[PDB]
Every structure is written in C-alpha cells, then in structure tokens.
Amino acid sequence: GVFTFEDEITSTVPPAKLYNAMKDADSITPKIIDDVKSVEIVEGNGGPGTIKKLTIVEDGETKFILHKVESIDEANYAYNYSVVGGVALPPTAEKITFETKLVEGPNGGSIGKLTLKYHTKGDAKPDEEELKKGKAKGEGLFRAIEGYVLANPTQY
Ligand SMILES: O=C(O)/C=C/c1ccc(O)c(O)c1
Numbered sequence: 001g002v003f004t005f006e007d008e009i010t011s012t013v014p015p016a017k018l019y020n021a022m023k024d025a026d027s028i029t030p031k032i033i034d035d036v037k038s039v040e041i042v043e044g045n046g047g048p049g050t051i052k053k054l055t056i057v058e059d060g061e062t063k064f065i066l067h068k069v070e071s072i073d074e075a076n077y078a079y080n081y082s083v084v085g086g087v088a089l090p091p092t093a094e095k096i097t098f099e100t101k102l103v104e105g106p107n108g109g110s111i112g113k114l115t116l117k118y119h120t121k122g123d124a125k126p127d128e129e130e131l132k133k134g135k136a137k138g139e140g141l142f143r144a145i146e147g148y149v150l151a152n153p154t155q156y
C-alpha cells in the first residue's frame with residue numbers, strides 16, 4: 001500500500017536562494033550533517049533516474065543509503081527523491097519517497113513543504129518509529145541547507 005504524510009517547516013531565507021542550495025545538497029550535507037560522510041552519483045547525471053549512494057555513520061557503524069532522483073521542477077523549487085536501499089529503508093517497505101517543494105513565506109522567507117510517501121509491501125502498515133526517523137531526516141536536510149546559506153551569505 002501507500003501511506004502519505006505531510007510536514008511543513010519555515011525559514012527566514014527566501015526560496016530561490018534556499019532552492020539553489022538544495023541542488024548542491026550532495027556537497028553540503030556531508031559537511032554540516034555529522035552522520036553523513038559522502039554522497040556519490042552511482043548511475044545517472046544528477047537528473048531523474050539518477051541513483052546516489054549516501055554513506056552514513058550510525059553508532060560507529062558505516063551504513064549505505066540509496067536514493068533515486070524522481071523529479072526536479074526548478075520552476076516550483078521542487079525536488080523529489082526516493083529512498084530505495086540501505087538499512088534506513090525498512091524490510092516491510094518497498095520504498096519511501098520524499099517530495100520537496102519550497103514556497104514563499106509571508107515575510108519574504110520560505111516554507112518547506114514535505115510530502116512523504118511510504119510504499120509498503122503487501123498489507124504492511126508503516127512503523128510509527130520509522131515515520132519519526134523519516135520526518136527527522138527531512139528536517140535535518142532542510143536545516144543543513146538553511147544553515148549553509150546563512151553561514152555563507154555571499155555564496156548565493
Ligand atoms: O521536513 C520538512 O518538513 C521539509 C523539508 C524540505 C522542504 C523543502 C526542501 O527544498 C528541502 O530540502 C526539505
């Protein structure tokens with residue numbers, strides 16, 4: 001089945017700037033997020049169909065995560081990717097999709113809109129715990145991009 005959740009998050013940074021930073025997330029996230037060590041393009045050119053290997057450290061243990069890039073709408077500050085591999089993905093789960101979109105906040109800031117689509121095998125429902133982890137992963141992504149931008153203002 002497919003189980004669908006939505007979260008939102010605010011920033012002071014405007015969306016255009018924040019979105020350009022999302023594009024460089026493969027180079028940003030390993031710097032600012034401690035667990036993340038690197039992000040390698042394994043197959044593809046960075047566009048839809050691309051597979052990325054993330055290398056995590058979770059309790060002094062090296063783990064891998066595989067992302068599939070699903071779509072990229074730069075007009076709508078949108079970036080959609082799927083977790084398709086690794087330990088972070090549950091054995092009950094076919095895949096987990098992160099659909100991101102930045103939109104304008106009411107003070108010239110921005111609003112991160114996450115739609116999380118958790119694809120299960122058969123009649124399994126998602127684990128309430130792995131939902132907390134998934135939502136948390138998405139926050140840390142956003143905070144990393146935001147942090148990078150605020151710490152490097154001339155960059156964007
Ligand atoms: O966790 C959330 O609620 C939103 C996350 C989010 C939203 C938009 C982006 O461009 C992004 O990298 C992350």
Ligand SMILES: O=C(O)/C=C/c1ccc(O)c(O)c1
Nearest residue numbers: 025026029039137138140141
């Ligand atoms: O939650 C995490 O720990 C890392 C998330 C992450 C890391 C690298 C990316 O390019 C991305 O879109 C998301």
